[PDB]
Design a protein around this motif. Sequence first.
Motif, PDB file in Angstrom:
ATOM      1  N   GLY A  73       0.792  -1.212   0.000  1.00 52.91           N
ATOM      2  CA  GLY A  73       0.000   0.000   0.000  1.00 52.91           C
ATOM      3  C   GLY A  73       0.822   1.258   0.000  1.00 52.91           C
ATOM      4  O   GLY A  73       2.006   1.253  -0.317  1.00 52.91           O
ATOM      5  N   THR A  74       0.153   2.362   0.289  1.00 60.54           N
ATOM      6  CA  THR A  74       0.775   3.668   0.207  1.00 60.54           C
ATOM      7  C   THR A  74       1.450   3.976   1.537  1.00 60.54           C
ATOM      8  O   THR A  74       0.927   3.650   2.595  1.00 60.54           O
ATOM      9  CB  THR A  74      -0.277   4.745  -0.140  1.00 60.54           C
ATOM     10  OG1 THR A  74      -0.753   4.527  -1.474  1.00 60.54           O
ATOM     11  CG2 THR A  74       0.328   6.136  -0.078  1.00 60.54           C
ATOM     12  N   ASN A  88      -5.033   2.100   5.950  1.00 61.81           N
ATOM     13  CA  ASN A  88      -4.770   1.618   4.599  1.00 61.81           C
ATOM     14  C   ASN A  88      -3.972   0.323   4.569  1.00 61.81           C
ATOM     15  O   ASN A  88      -4.196  -0.522   3.687  1.00 61.81           O
ATOM     16  CB  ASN A  88      -4.113   2.692   3.733  1.00 61.81           C
ATOM     17  CG  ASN A  88      -2.662   2.907   4.067  1.00 61.81           C
ATOM     18  OD1 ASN A  88      -2.310   3.232   5.206  1.00 61.81           O
ATOM     19  ND2 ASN A  88      -1.797   2.734   3.066  1.00 61.81           N
TER      20      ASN A  88
HETATM   21 CL   LIG Z   1      -3.015   2.260   0.096  1.00 58.53          CL
END
Ligand SMILES: [Cl-]
Lengths: 99, 99
Positions: A73-74, A88
């Motif tokens: 993910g980010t 997230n």
């Molecule tokens: Cl993400």
Amino acid sequence: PQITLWQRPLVTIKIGGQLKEALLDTGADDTVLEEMSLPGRWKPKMIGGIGGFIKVRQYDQIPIEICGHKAIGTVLVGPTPTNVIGRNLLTQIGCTLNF
Amino acid sequence: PQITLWQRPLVTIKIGGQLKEALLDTGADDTVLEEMSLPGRWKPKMIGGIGGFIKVRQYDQIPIEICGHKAIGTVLVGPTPTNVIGRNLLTQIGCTLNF
Ligand SMILES: [Cl-]
Ligand SMILES: CNC(=O)CO[C@H]1CO[C@@H]2OC[C@H](OC(=O)N[C@@H](Cc3ccccc3)[C@H](O)CN(CC(C)C)S(=O)(=O)c3ccc(OC)cc3)[C@@H]21
Ligand SMILES: [Cl-]
Ligand SMILES: [Cl-]
């Protein structure tokens, strides 16, 4: 695991070849880490919490391992006072609140 | 209940007879609410987050209902961006993280 909240819920993460300690943080939308190098594209972002905003670099599609659990993910990188794992990534490892 | 983290874990709380929305926040040691009135005397506290520090008013032994679960404890009032329920009260309602 079942993680108590008597103490800060700290875990070890593996990211970009590095081991780091981070807080499992249901109040954070995003994962935010202290200054570090990551590969690939990034774009600047402002994120805000108590006390106001900081500028971070946003890296997308970063592999991370949390408690033996792989996810992608980010990751936001910048001058946070402490490393937080946000929703997230918590979703990806199947993390829930229970009471 | 079991609360997943695909959206913000916003719940309804009741404090001083009024309903508010607040975030269940495992990354917060303490519970911090937006400006409001509470009874009694308060003490000073500085709390730090992502963007720096803010000054808050600390009220002790305040009754507060969180998702219908009764707690009585310390509530900080100040210029937070959002109401946050921290570990001081999450432990009172028996909350854990699970994955
Ligand atoms: Cl993400
Ligand atoms: C303005 N921004 C917004 O509106 C939304 O943007 C926010 C949300 O998602 C995004 O991801 C990263 C950041 O999130 C947070 O920063 N999360 C905060 C909670 C919070 C959520 C929304 C806004 C502000 C704070 C933490 O979960 C708690 N603490 C932060 C620590 C974990 C870094 S605390 O709040 O600082 C604190 C410190 C001490 C204390 O007692 C001692 C109790 C609390 C962005
Ligand atoms: Cl799920
Ligand atoms: Cl308390």
